[PDB]
Design a protein around this ligand. Structure first.
Ligand SMILES: [Ca+2]
Ligand SMILES: [Ca+2]
Ligand SMILES: [Ca+2]
Ligand SMILES: [Ca+2]
Ligand SMILES: [Ca+2]
Ligand SMILES: [Ca+2]
Ligand SMILES: [Ca+2]
Ligand SMILES: [Ca+2]
Length: 294
DNA sequence: GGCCTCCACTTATTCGACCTCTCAG
DNA sequence: CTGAGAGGTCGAATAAGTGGAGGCC
């Protein structure tokens, strides 16, 4: 395998990767609970390469199928979690996931002292799990009532580097060739779109993208209860003089790099105005088709 | 015995990706 | 006519999670 730049790896960990803390009822321990702390990243089968290069970069973690179409990288071996702590202490996360890392860091110290084998240590872990990701199940809520959960700090940090954004984009980014039917002679408009999806927790971070990249805007989407944000750039001059030069200097990792490469091919056709012709339009449809089924 | 670590595989919901239209210059 | 938003839809490569058990000191 090949190494991954640490900042690119952190950025990819802001977009992918989830900390996890298992607190299960268990008959084969005195305290009656089985604990499992770790970190994981789940991608499509086609992107198993990233996991292998991560596994080789950190020298930690195990790979396993995640259903019929996906695979994951899991790090739960306790001694291997030191690498995860060492990496993120030097290359910290900047999304709200950094608050989950801190809770993960606290759980590590409880288990490091072996306090998870006691009833008090478990209670401490439960107070931490209450604020980690999706909190506690009602089964444990009623099991450990009147527990003062730990406080979850609001993360509001600046983008550290451009490499961080390359990794974050590879995880939650998208390079799309928009074909828009138009009641006109040619019939269709071509328009490149660069976007980054993200939960509305990080509205601050998302908004700062406009300031950091000097272009784009924000779009608030809602699916009933749930809402998230999209950082979107469509103005071609910005895509040509900002987005494209940026990601040529700071390589994307995974299958998204292939989409970026075809994306840039369409940008070339557009610079030459070949997107107003007919032969050029067949070319753009071929490139776009190669990005959907590919 | 007591406890750790891994594979199988799912759920909820947060992404990615896919549209189509208005309208000013 | 064209470009740049405006205004969306939608399915799971979503982010997060669980059951089962082989493995080790
Ligand atoms: Ca993400
Ligand atoms: Ca994922
Ligand atoms: Ca190792
Ligand atoms: Ca394996
Ligand atoms: Ca492991
Ligand atoms: Ca260190
Ligand atoms: Ca992704
Ligand atoms: Ca332009």
């Amino acid at each position: 395998a090949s190494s991954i730049n640490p900042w690119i790896l952190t950025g990819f960990a802001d977009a992918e990767g989830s900390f996890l803390l298992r607190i299960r009822k268990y008959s084969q321990t005195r305290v009656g609970y089985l604990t499992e702390l770790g970190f994981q990243i789940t991608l499509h089968n086609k992107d198993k390469s990233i996991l292998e290069n991560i596994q080789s970069t950190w020298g930690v973690g195990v790979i396993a199928n995640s259903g019929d179409n996906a695979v994951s990288l899991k790090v739960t071996r306790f001694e291997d979690l030191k690498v995860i702590i060492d990496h993120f202490e030097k290359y910290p996360l900047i999304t709200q996931k950094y608050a989950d890392y801190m809770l993960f860091k606290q759980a590590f110290n409880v288990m490091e002292n072996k306090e998870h084998l006691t009833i008090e240590g478990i209670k401490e872990l439960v107070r931490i799990k209450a604020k980690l990701n999706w909190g506690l199940t009602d089964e444990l809520k009623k099991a450990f009532p009147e527990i003062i959960s730990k406080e979850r700090s609001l993360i509001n940090k600046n983008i550290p580097n451009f490499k961080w954004l390359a990794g974050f984009t590879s995880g939650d980014g998208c390079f799309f060739v928009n074909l828009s039917k138009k009641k006109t002679k040619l019939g269709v408009q071509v328009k490149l779109v660069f976007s980054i999806s993200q939960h509305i927790r990080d509205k601050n971070l998302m908004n700062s993208l406009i300031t950091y990249l000097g272009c784009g805007y924000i779009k608030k989407k809602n699916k009933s209860e749930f809402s998230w944000l999209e950082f979107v750039v469509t103005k071609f001059s910005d895509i040509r003089d900002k987005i494209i030069p940026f990601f040529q200097e700071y390589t994307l990792i995974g299958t998204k790099l292939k989409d970026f490469e075809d994306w840039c091919k369409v940008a070339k056709l557009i610079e030459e105005k070949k997107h107003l012709t007919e032969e050029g339009l067949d070319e753009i449809k071929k490139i776009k088709l190669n990005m959907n089924k590919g």
